[PDB]
């Protein structure tokens, strides 16, 4: 019946994996909430855990914090009785173990130790927020001393600490107040660094925490407009090399735009130093994304026309020897920071900004690299580098057409994007400029996780447009050939191609004849129920009574 | 890409693609049966010989196909009919998608084979094990067997004018589900809709049945119950064979003195178009309409206009993946590739080395085996090890993810 929790406690001071995991697993059971073991047996377990955490060989500590986490999560009485004492012990060990950091990270287990301690503190103070009476008198006299330690530790371990301070700053905006300057310093020291040794997650977290720093109606607006105003100097610095006023409607808009960062220097004899310009614009875009896409405890003014104008002027930036070669690569990356901002302005706000959904699609044509000589032809060698960016473009288009829907008039950007997507759907080879008797082994074959993205884009195109003939026949040939190839290689057809053939059957558009019976010939032993309804239709849905 | 025709006469084994004008005559083949050939596991072709009591096995995977017999398979009895139950739903790895390639060794689960006097032999193919033998199912013969869904149900037809629907789990571990006596003379063929679902409760699956009674009977299959017919037609000529369009838009019937067509979405003289086959799930009336066919030389009299395509004494029919070409086998041992609309032959395939076209097949394509056990039955033993031969097949095996790995890596160094 009952597993005698004293037995778990006494077998816990020594327990390796295949015993310790059973101890943690059986302690989930709710029958340890019951009369007259609530003052004499849980006390024994908690004193055992406390003796494990208070002094140990750094294995009993890891074991102990995991044990307290599981116990407090699956038993609210242990929380309401002893959570303050457990959290005090864990914070004390964290404090002594972060008083030194370069003698505690010396053995490849200090990192995991900080991970488990920080995670355990976070989990405890994420369960003591559903109890007002308990968030008093166990956390609030302790956060004043918890938070400076976490700040000092975030200088070295931002990937692990910053979500905790983010949640604490968000749920408590009045105890983080007198430490706020001390936080800001470290965040400017983490942005003044190279800022590419940090991951995307860490970059986003420092941006988000700097954004939530300004919670202390109006300060959010000041920080937001400061970051928005730090865009125009960089663009005018880029305008001394692209020679604007060749097109004046752009230069009218550039001067129509409205601080801790260094004013940067550029040298043309060292063209690699031109990689500072994208690596500042991406930074400011991340900070802007943080100020915009985050939740708040109050509403906020967000300028949408301003950032739309900013995105519009970013994608206008396009068309001694190696310098020209380096200029031919930074500019797509510059445009992509307009793409990356419209993708967040679209999904998070949705139909707000419906007015801008037609200009974005026209401006995406500027992102496409054309051949240099005079022509409207696509430069496929540049497109081979830009794969992730064009995937982001495809997701942006699919985000827009969820709201716009089917479109009467057609535009030219979609046909060029289809040509791009059909180029990217071909198995790349990188020996074409020239063997060793086998040039077919030097290919980069396209996974199915990429074909899914391409096929979702073609679904969006065939749904909402009556396309021209040749950009339709290419799609049909692609779908049929690849489906047959995969049905030979495999014994089946993946689901994205089936969805593509479904859309090709349902939405033929300008065609005078469907591809229905060929889809069924391919779907011979892979049956599906869409075409049953099409060929063998059903009685309506209310005739039955 | 192109389509591939595998047809065999009583003394000839030709294989040829439709748009290639190249062909391979298999050396040793003999048949006097209507449907006796099958293509097994995209690596093999099985043909049941006549008057030898064995199956010939040809390897058809090569770039230069094996003209000769790759292998033989003796049997207990000479048997006429064949059908295969293809294994599906094993290559995706539904637990997590890895999209396994096919192995070099693949096989189906079953090999249905039926002989004269109505006996049915079914064999596991991964290991030759005769799981079950039904001594008598039809009481004169069997002429065609087909698995309509993947391995779920199989349908049989013989010369007792009864078409039987089994259930594969109730046949291999028999008491069939339903029997169909609506014909009076031997049922020579049937066909089922190429468009199908995963189940029968939410589909209306059409079964066309054809006999020497000069009738064509269209049955609605949706059970959960018995099937209900909703139309039957009638013919002046002794009908022999039948195929459908790949979407159940038409019917094409092969018979003595020509091959005839029939539109199922029948267009009247008001620009009014009537679907003869309308139905639902299990709720459906039993009032099967009657109509009669008459050639070309408006339907409330009980007559319908079939359009004559050809004048050849056809034995068998098949259809292309487009749904626009018929491949018809005459009694002079040659195939005609014809176009449905214009009624103009485009190609004529003969064999080179004679009897009629026994059977033929088509599927599109792009540019050892166990011995069968003669009278042995795997019983209710549990200590028996039901060993099979099997192979799984490898799974299919960018840069921004690599750079993100690099960015996460760089933080650990203080240098």
């Amino acid at each position: 019946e009952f597993i005698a929790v004293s037995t778990l406690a006494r077998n816990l001071e020594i327990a390796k994996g295949n015993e310790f995991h059973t101890i943690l697993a059986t302690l989930r059971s709710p029958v340890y909430i019951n009369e007259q073991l609530l003052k004499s047996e849980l006390s024994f377990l908690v004193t055992k855990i406390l003796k494990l955490i208070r002094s140990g060989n750094d294995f009993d500590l890891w074991k102990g914090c995991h044990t307290s986490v599981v116990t407090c999560a699956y038993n609210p009485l242990v929380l309401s009785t002893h959570g303050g004492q457990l959290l005090a012990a864990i914070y004390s060990r964290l404090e002594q173990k972060t008083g030194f950091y370069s003698s505690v990270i010396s053995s490849s287990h200090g990192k995991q130790l900080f991970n488990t301690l920080i995670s355990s503190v976070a989990i405890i103070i994420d369960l003591m927020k559903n109890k007002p009476t308990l968030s008093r008198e166990a956390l609030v006299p302790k956060l004043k001393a918890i938070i400076p330690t976490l700040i000092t530790l975030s200088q070295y371990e931002p990937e692990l600490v910053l979500p905790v301070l983010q949640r604490i700053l968000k749920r408590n905006t009045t105890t983080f107040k007198p430490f706020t300057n001390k936080f800001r310093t470290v965040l400017i020291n983490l942005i003044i660094s190279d800022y590419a040794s940090l991951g995307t997650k860490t970059q986003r977290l420092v941006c988000e925490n700097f954004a939530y720093l300004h919670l202390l109606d109006s300060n959010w607006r000041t920080g937001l407009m400061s970051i928005l105003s730090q865009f125009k100097p960089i663009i005018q610095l880029c305008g001394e090399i692209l020679d604007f006023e060749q097109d004046n409607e752009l230069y009218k808009l550039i001067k129509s735009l409205p601080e801790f960062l260094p004013s940067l220097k550029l040298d043309f004899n060292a063209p690699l130093t031109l990689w500072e310009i994208p690596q500042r614009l991406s930074l400011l875009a991340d900070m802007l994304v943080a100020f915009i896409s985050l939740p708040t405890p109050f509403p906020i003014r967000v300028p949408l026309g301003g950032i739309n104008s900013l995105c519009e002027v970013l994608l206008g930036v396009s068309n001694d020897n190696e310098l020209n070669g380096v200029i031919n690569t930074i500019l797509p990356q510059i445009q992509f920071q307009g793409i990356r901002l419209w993708e967040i302005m679209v999904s998070k706000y949705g139909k707000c900004g419906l007015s801008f959904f037609e200009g974005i699609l026209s401006s995406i044509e500027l992102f496409i690299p054309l051949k240099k000589k005079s022509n409207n032809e696509i430069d496929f060698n540049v497109v081979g580098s830009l794969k992730f960016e064009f995937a982001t473009v495809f997701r942006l288009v699919n985000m827009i057409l969820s709201h716009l829907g089917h479109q009467l008039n057609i535009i030219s950007v979609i046909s060029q994007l289809i040509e791009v997507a059909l180029f990217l759907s071909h198995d790349k080879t990188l020996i074409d400029s020239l063997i060793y008797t086998h040039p077919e082994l030097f290919v980069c074959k396209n996974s199915m996780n990429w074909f899914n993205e391409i096929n979702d884009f073609f679904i969006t195109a065939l749904n909402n447009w009556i396309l021209p003939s040749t950009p339709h026949i290419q799609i049909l040939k692609y779908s049929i050939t690849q489906s047959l190839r995969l049905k030979e290689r495999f014994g089946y057809i993946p689901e994205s191609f089936v969805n593509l053939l479904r859309c090709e059957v349902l939405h033929p558009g300008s065609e005078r004849v469907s591809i229905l019976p060929i889809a069924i010939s391919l779907l011979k032993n892979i049956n599906d129920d869409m075409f049953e309804l099409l060929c063998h239709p059903k009685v309506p849905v209310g005739m039955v009574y | 890409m192109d389509e591939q025709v595998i047809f065999t006469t009583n003394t000839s084994g030709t294989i040829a693609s439709v748009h290639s004008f190249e062909q391979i005559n298999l050396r040793q083949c003999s048949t006097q049966s209507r449907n006796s050939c099958v293509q097994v596991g995209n690596k093999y072709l099985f043909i049941a010989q006549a008057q030898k009591a064995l199956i010939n096995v040809y390897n058809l995977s090569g770039s230069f196909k094996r003209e000769s017999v790759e292998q033989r398979l003796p049997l207990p009895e000479i048997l006429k009919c064949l059908e295969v139950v293809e294994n599906d739903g094993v290559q995706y790895d539904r637990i997590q998608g890895v999209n396994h390639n096919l192995p070099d060794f693949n096989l189906p689960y079953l090999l249905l084979g039926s002989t004269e006097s109505g006996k049915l032999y079914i064999w596991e193919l991964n290991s030759g094990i005769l799981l079950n033998v039904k001594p008598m199912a039809h009481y004169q013969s069997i002429t065609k067997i087909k698995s309509i869904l993947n391995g779920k149900y199989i349908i049989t037809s013989g010369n007792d004018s009864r078409v039987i629907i089994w259930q594969t789990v109730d046949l291999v571990s028999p008491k069939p589900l339903c029997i169909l006596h609506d014909h009076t003379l031997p049922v020579t063929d049937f066909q089922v809709s190429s468009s199908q679902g995963k189940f029968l409760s939410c589909t209306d699956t059409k079964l066309f049945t054809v006999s020497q009674d000069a009738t064509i009977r269209c049955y609605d299959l949706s059970l959960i119950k018995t099937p209900v017919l909703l139309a039957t037609f009638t013919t002046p000529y002794s009908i022999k064979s039948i195929v459908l369009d790949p979407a159940d838009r038409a019917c094409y019937i092969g018979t003595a003195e020509g091959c005839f067509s029939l539109n199922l979405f029948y267009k009247l003289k008001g620009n009014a178009i009537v679907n003869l086959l309308q139905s639902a799930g299990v709720n459906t009336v039993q009032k099967g309409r009657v109509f009669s066919l008459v050639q070309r030389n408006l339907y409330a009299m009980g007559q319908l206009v079939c359009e004559n395509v050809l004048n050849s004494n056809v034995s068998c029919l098949e259809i292309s993946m487009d749904g626009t070409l018929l491949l018809i086998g005459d009694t002079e041992g040659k195939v005609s590739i014809a176009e449905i609309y214009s009624k103009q032959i485009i190609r004529t395939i003969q064999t080179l080395t004679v009897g009629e076209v026994t059977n033929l097949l088509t599927n599109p394509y792009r540019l050892k085996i166990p011995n069968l056990q003669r009278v042995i039955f795997d019983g209710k033993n549990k200590g028996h090890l039901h060993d099979i031969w099997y192979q799984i097949g490898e799974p299919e095996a960018d840069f921004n993810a690599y750079l993100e790995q690099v960015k996460t890596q760089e933080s650990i160094f203080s240098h």
Binding site: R512, I518 | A250
Partner: peptide, 24 residues
């Protein structure tokens, strides 16, 4: 007129070029 019916012209699906082989 209807896309999902048998058309009234002889060679449909000739403009998809599935079965053609281009000469090089």
């Amino acid at each position: 007129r209807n896309p999902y019916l048998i058309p009234d012209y002889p060679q449909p699906f000739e403009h998809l070029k599935l079965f053609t082989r281009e000469l090089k």
